[PDB]
């Protein structure tokens, strides 16, 4: 049923399943925008494949050939199957548009599936090539940051009663993780553009290319006289193919700008999470994280993503908000917070 | 079976599944009215799609064409499939109402599915764009509020034997979360109005537009003489489509007032949860939360929603009720409550 | 449906299931490259088998024979089944290409399944022959290494306030595990090359070998006169077979270089994990692990794989990174880390 | 689908399910070679049964009889069913090869299933007759051995700062468990040889025995004149049967050497696990476990299997390896290990 496909591919957490493993529990490792881009670009062609052959649209066979009335039931079935298999043998069939349109009409689901798999590949490469590195690294970074906050709080309390910095500093120099990331991003963009090109071509077919003339006159039937010289076959479910093709095209051409936007990692580094902790006196009072096509920018983005997980950041951020309001004091309100654990 | 669809889409918690994650356990993040509006507006077209093709209403094919008696079984099947695919090719078929009614009759399930997906989109954008922010924020707010209550109770006990305020204060100024919310609300309203327009048009079709004249005379069949000039086809299951369309129309036009009501967030801020804690002496004796198209109003609504979760509010609220009755005393009954944990 | 096969064989963790047992929890025992090579080489022919007979491509029967019109329905069915079973009996059928092409056309799915099983065998032999040995050994090695790190940290702290080496040393001499590994690697390579050869041959068939002349004239039918001398049969779904064959061929010929690369275990030993711990003063300041076709190289690779699991390595590695930056000091920053447990 | 059968019977842990019970958690009770032999010998005929009737090979019915054209559809169906049921009644049908080939062709799946069950029986008898005894016994043995190791370690530590032997000794005399084991081994061998004999006979059939002449002339039809004297039936799916039969034959004749090898339990007792603990001074310095067709040999094999489970053995074995290298000292390195628990 259509509604089951709808649930499975839109309303269920399809490709939204968190890593079912104790290694990555609560950590993102994939920016939400990239995750939704991948989910769309992959699940949409699958959904359209499943829709093109839903029992509510498909009338039956994918082809019909209109054998003469003198033919039996089984001779008609033979003609149908023969021409279905003969869309490939270019010697027999003769269509106005050519053999390539028929090739495409027969294998449209396979092509959409190929595009889905190709679009799924770069995210898989990212999840299995650069995900564990950044996972471990930002895990250590959050641990060290929370520890720095606890140290600042203990120092302020004692007054009342920087290795992670060097790590981010050295990360600013290497650029392995960022070229991997922009490589996957560029790969997805290229595959999406090729898919839009193919879909725009396919949707642009003569809309009568699904009608082709087929002839069962190979082998011993060539001398047979009771068979007509040619049969008028028609590839059913081609209009549905072109419609879903134009839909996929319109969606992918809307998606491509999002991808080419995600391509610019330095421009996206905004709402500096480093400033909140910079308000604290103990840690270095410096953002020290911006303006560079290097892994530092990538870690900035992933920190801005996974930063709500540490309570230390939540308290420091609400305190920063009140500082923008300017009501109380930093160490007094920090001691009043009492959120070490 | 119909009853299985009934269970799945009405009696099961379809789209009522709580977030299966330790991050959001017991927190709402979606007002109950918005949740039910989304569940209705999305699951209803899905349910009607599943009903239109239930095995108990559908007689069989979606089309039948009444080929002459001299035709074989397979020639008749070919005519049926050809005309089914030829509802799109406007050159062949000639109907009184036009080709657009037939287009709509064939793709009615796809259109209902498109409307379901479009109506599901804004809630998804809300759940993935503004949900974590408000989640963390109101979580911190409830923690600070419960802590304020424990502090007031300890102070009253010692007599016997305000950062969250500034947070709500600064929230009153920014308006990001409220424009996001009213944007999703307005989006759902626009999509619902477009759906009602389309359904009112579709249901208003001539009810004979499902009968169209089709002609298999393209290709080599144009010279064929044993074929009749045209066939009388009829799109079965169109009356069912129009009936379910009028049902969906009547439901969506009842739903739209609820949406346009939810559009007014300040008017909905009622039964001030802040007053209960204002009865307490320690916390600021002021509502300080009303009368503004800002995130403060949004947080008021979400607090009024998720406020039954904190026991501190339950005790203070029953105490406020007794105060409205006027029997005992506030600190004495608070010490007699003994509900710190 | 095609999309279900897609999910099951690409998007689900097919052959990516971790060992569901408390013996191996978090340990790899299979290099990621070998794991993906096996998953591809095995699941791809299965996916193509499932695709070749998807309800969206398959028109129906796998064969049709075009009996004369005077034949009944059941006589036609008999002719079809007879010729289907008679692709093997070489005395009856006479095809231009020969009987071997028809043999292959009938049993193509069985051959692809055989190749899948054969490619799955060497990984199974590795997982059940050499996996527990290396599991226990590298488990002990990581335990001893973490213990060495804790000892160095305690020594540095006391200043403030080598059996695993011999094990790796003796492992450098034996070469059982490495010949097992390169034997499985060479086995997979040979099977892949044979599969590419067979697929290149099959895809290179005349594309009309699916049409063969069959004759039901054995037994009592030899004297029957109302039967024609021969029937023109055609093996449907052969073009699909050749297409998926060319796809599998193109994928396997891309895979073979990866395998022959994995064949060189010493060349792959890079990014020495031993150097990080060599920076520590307590443990032996020497890599002592390289340049040899022996089990030592294999353990180096498996350590480089499973080394992110021990936190001790994470701390020492970030410290080594800062040392490459050159900001602080080793024992002071180690005491400041405080990551013993 | 074929790929589902592939997953279920090869890639899933079919007959590899560990005992889902707290009594046997982590204990083997079945040597890995015997386990794989049983899994192959049982699951292979099941897999071939499931393959012989996969929807991708089976054309339809298992028989077709070619009734005359004057027959109706239902008369033809009657002829088919009659001859299918009449392969047993030897009075009616007359085939060149005889009635036994047809008997075999009809009941080939049942025979393969019978062989699968018969091969599964001896492992079941072992698992339910001698498994608990050896389970409890080797459990106690490992407990006593680990305890002996802890005692030796405590003695060495005190210097720094034998009932299990008698049990194995008395086990050397009784021979119940070993005759049970070799009885199951011999049973599996005999069943495998009988299966190879039957399969070699079946595959050696004339390949035209699937064509037989059937006659519906019993009862009132004997006087009927409009029925022909005999019908030419053909058992479809017999070539597939013979092919899968030759496959099963080739696999079983490869398996039989493995079984007859497993028959020699004393020869298999190698890589003495007793020597590792013999290196320890406390326990008896003697293997005292070899050279006898008695339960002692069986316990040696099961200990060599389940010996990696005790950490005590792992430490003593790595220490023995270093002793073969000759670097340090036994008690000092044992105290440095610190692996009592
Ligand atoms: C600038 C980078 C651009 C990257 C673009 C990527 C685009 C998407 C490609 C998707 C391909 C399918 C999905 C692959 C997922 C798994 C990839 C992976 O993790 O590969 C790891 C592999 C490890 O190789 P290994 O010899 O073990 O060396 C490292 C350890 N010492 O790493 C390897 O290098 C092994 C595989 C290649 C071997 C050489 C092949 C040519 C010879
Ligand atoms: C240089 C090595 C090259 C290896 C290439 C391997 C290629 C892939 C082969 C795949 C075969 C199918 C999958 C087999 C998986 C299980 C294999 C396994 O673990 O075998 C263990 C078996 C143990 O034999 P056992 O008598 O118990 O002796 C050891 C304990 N004392 O070990 C055995 O030796 C038993 C089986 C063989 C017995 C002798 C047969 C000939 C006589
Ligand atoms: C990806 C998208 C692929 C589409 C583009 C393919 C490039 C084809 C360009 C060459 C075309 C060609 O050879 O010309 C036709 C032959 O095509 C052919 O007959 C070649 C067939 C094209 C292959 C398409 C089949 C898709 C299979 C993909 C399945 C993947 C499965 C993944 C799981 C001739 O004919 P004509 O039209 O010129 O005749 C009228 C006279 N000009
Ligand atoms: C918005 C996207 C609109 C795309 C439509 C542009 C093509 C117009 C072509 C004529 C319109 C029409 O009805 O005729 C067919 C297209 O119909 C169609 O196929 C139009 C159906 C509209 C489908 C889009 C609805 C959902 C879009 C996004 C959903 C989310 C032609 O057919 P042809 O292209 O074969 O002939 C090639 C023509 N020279
Ligand atoms: C969303 C609701 C969409 C319905 C409204 C579409 C706007 C169509 C307006 C233009 C109509 C048009 O082009 O006129 C007809 C051609 O329509 C056509 O042939 C165009 C076909 C309209 C597209 C509707 C197909 C729905 C596909 C949506 C699937 C989405 C899938 C999502 C998973 C001509 O004919 P005539 O009647 O004038 O002839 C008698 C003479 N006047
Ligand atoms: C309450 C909503 C009532 C809607 C009915 C208004 C339309 C009346 C049109 C005539 C009545 C009738 O039986 O004829 C068909 C409508 O029937 C129908 O389709 C009426 C069936 C009533 C269905 C509503 C029942 C449940 C409503 C909510 C459930 C929750 C006409 O058919 P047409 O519209 O094609 O011809 C266009 C006519 N000029
Ligand atoms: C693995 C790939 C196997 C393909 C290669 C097999 C080698 C065959 C080489 C000999 C060929 C042969 O005997 O010649 C033909 C007979 O073949 C035959 O009739 C022999 C049939 C070949 C066996 C292929 C069947 C595959 C079964 C595998 C299933 C595995 C299942 C696993 C679960 C004669 O004919 P002609 O063409 O010369 O006549 C025209 C005159 N020259
Ligand atoms: C990239 C791989 C391209 C492989 C194509 C090379 C063969 C060209 C042969 C002519 C092209 C054509 O359309 O005719 C058939 C091949 O089509 C085909 O079968 C071409 C379809 C292309 C399929 C590859 C698309 C996905 C590749 C990887 C996906 C990941 C011939 O048919 P024949 O080979 O029987 O006749 C033997 C010819 N003398
Ligand atoms: C296990 C493998 C069993 C196969 C070997 C059975 C031994 C049969 C030896 C005697 C044969 C016999 O009686 O001769 C034929 C009658 O056979 C018959 O009619 C007897 C039928 C043989 C029984 C095979 C049926 C298998 C059932 C197993 C199902 C198990 C299910 C488990 C869940 C006569 O005929 P002819 O050929 O001599 O005529 C031409 C003239 N010589
Ligand atoms: C390796 C095992 C090879 C077994 C083949 C030996 C029998 C040869 C007989 C002639 C070859 C042939 O194609 O004709 C049929 C056998 O084909 C076949 O049935 C040969 C197909 C080969 C199947 C083996 C492929 C996988 C083996 C292991 C996979 C793991 C004869 O048929 P018949 O035996 O009824 O006539 C009895 C003949 N006088
Ligand atoms: C990503 C954006 C640019 C996609 C837009 C759709 C593009 C790729 C489509 C739309 C119309 C298409 C064209 C329509 C018709 C023809 C004529 C034919 O003889 C060659 C291909 C050609 C020239 C097509 C090329 C691809 C095309 C230009
Ligand atoms: C949300 C509320 C307002 C929905 C009410 C249903 C509306 C949208 C429906 C009900 C009747 C419909 C009309 C019925 C008939 C026609 C004539 C046709 O030639 C053009 C469309 C037009 C003019 C329709 C437009 C849409 C319509 C006005
Ligand atoms: C791994 C790489 C090398 C695989 C490349 C495909 C190879 C194996 C394929 C491609 C074309 C094939 C050839 C095509 C045609 C013929 C003629 C025939 O009478 C004998 C086999 C022979 C000679 C084939 C042998 C195998 C072949 C050479
Ligand atoms: C385990 C090994 C030995 C199995 C080898 C296959 C054996 C059992 C097969 C292969 C060929 C077979 C023979 C083929 C033909 C005949 C002639 C027939 O009138 C009696 C049975 C007899 C004599 C068969 C007996 C079984 C047989 C010898």
From Swiss-Prot, chains A, B, C, D:
The gene is PANX1. Pfam families: Innexin (PF00876). The lineage of its organism: Eukaryota, Metazoa, Chordata, Craniata, Vertebrata. Disulfide bonds join 65-233, 83-214. This is Pannexin-1. GO terms for cellular component: bleb; endoplasmic reticulum; endoplasmic reticulum membrane; gap junction; membrane; plasma membrane; protein-containing complex. Changing residue 306 to Q: Impaired glycosylation; loss of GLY2 form; oocyte death. Glycans are attached at residue 223. It is a multi-pass membrane protein. Ion channel involved in a variety of physiological functions such as blood pressure regulation, apoptotic cell clearance and oogenesis. Forms anion-selective channels with relatively low conductance and an order of permeabilities: nitrate>iodide>chlroride>>aspartate=glutamate=gluconate. Can release ATP upon activation through phosphorylation or cleavage at C-terminus. May play a role as a Ca(2+)-leak channel to regulate ER Ca(2+) homeostasis. Its main location: membrane. The modification Phosphotyrosine is found at residue 167. The keyword Cell membrane applies. GO terms for molecular function: actin filament binding; ATP transmembrane transporter activity; calcium channel activity; gap junction channel activity; identical protein binding; leak channel activity; monoatomic anion channel activity; protease binding. Residues 1-39, 127-185, 256-341 are cytoplasmic. Residues 61-105, 207-234 are extracellular. It comes from Homo sapiens (Human). Widely expressed. Highest expression is observed in oocytes and brain. Detected at very low levels in sperm cells. Keywords: Calcium, Calcium channel, Calcium transport, Cell membrane, Differentiation, Disease variant, Disulfide bond, Endoplasmic reticulum, Glycoprotein, Ion channel, Ion transport, Membrane, Oogenesis, Phosphoprotein, S-nitrosylation, Transmembrane, Transmembrane helix, Transport. Changing residue 314 to E: In OZEMA7; impaired glycosylation resulting in the absence of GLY2 and the accumulation of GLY1 forms; results in increased hemi-channel activity. One of its GO terms (biological process) is calcium ion transport. It catalyses: chloride(in) = chloride(out); iodide(out) = iodide(in); ATP(in) = ATP(out); K(+)(in) = K(+)(out). InterPro entries: Innexin, Pannexin. It is linked to Oocyte/zygote/embryo maturation arrest 7: An autosomal dominant infertility disorder due to oocyte degeneration and death, which may occur before or after fertilization. Belongs to the pannexin family. Homoheptameric. S-nitrosylation inhibits channel currents and ATP release. N-glycosylation plays a role in cell surface targeting. Glycosylation at its extracellular surface makes unlikely that two oligomers could dock to form an intercellular channel such as in gap junctions. Exists in three glycosylation states: non-glycosylated (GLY0), high-mannose glycosylated (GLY1), and fully mature glycosylated (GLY2). The chain crosses the membrane at residues 40-60, 106-126, 186-206, 235-255. It is found in: Cell membrane; Endoplasmic reticulum membrane.
């Amino acid at each position: 049923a259509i509604a089951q496909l709808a649930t499975e591919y839109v309303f269920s957490d399809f490709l939204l399943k968190e890593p079912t493993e104790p290694k990555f529990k609560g950590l993102r490792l994939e920016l939400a925008v990239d995750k939704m881009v991948t989910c769309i670009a992959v699940g949409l062609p699958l959904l359209l494949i499943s829709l093109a052959f839903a029992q509510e649209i498909s009338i039956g066979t994918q082809i019909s050939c209109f054998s003469p009335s003198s033919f039996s039931w089984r001779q008609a079935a033979f003609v149908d199957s023969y021409c279905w298999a003969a869309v490939q043998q270019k010697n027999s069939l003769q269509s106005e548009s050519g053999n390539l349109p028929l090739w495409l009409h027969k294998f449209f689901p396979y092509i959409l599936l190929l595009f889905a798999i190709l679009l799924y590949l770069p995210p898989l490469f990212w999840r299995f090539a650069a995900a564990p590195h950044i996972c471990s690294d930002l895990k250590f970074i959050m641990e060290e940051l929370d520890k720095v906050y606890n140290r600042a709080i203990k120092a302020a309390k004692s007054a009342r009663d920087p290795i992670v910095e060097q790590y981010l500093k050295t990360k600013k120099n290497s650029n392995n993780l960022i070229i991997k990331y922009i490589s996957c991003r560029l790969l997805t963009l290229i595959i999406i553009l090729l898919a839009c090109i193919y879909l725009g071509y396919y949707f642009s077919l003569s809309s009568l290319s699904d009608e082709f003339v087929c002839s069962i006159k190979s082998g011993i039937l060539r001398a047979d006289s009771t068979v007509p010289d040619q049969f008028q076959c028609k590839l059913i479910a081609v209009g549905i193919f072109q419609l879903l093709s134009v839909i996929n095209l319109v969606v992918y051409v809307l998606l491509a700008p999002v991808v080419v936007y995600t391509l610019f990692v330095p421009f996206r580094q905004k709402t500096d999470v480093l400033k909140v902790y910079e308000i604290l006196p103990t840690f270095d009072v410096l953002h020290f994280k911006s303006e560079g096509y290097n892994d530092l920018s990538l870690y900035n983005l992933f920190l801005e993503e996974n930063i709500s997980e540490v309570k230390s950041y939540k308290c420091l951020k609400v305190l920063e908000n009140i500082k923008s309001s300017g009501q109380g004091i930093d160490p007094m309100l920090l001691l009043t917070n009492l959120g070490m654990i």
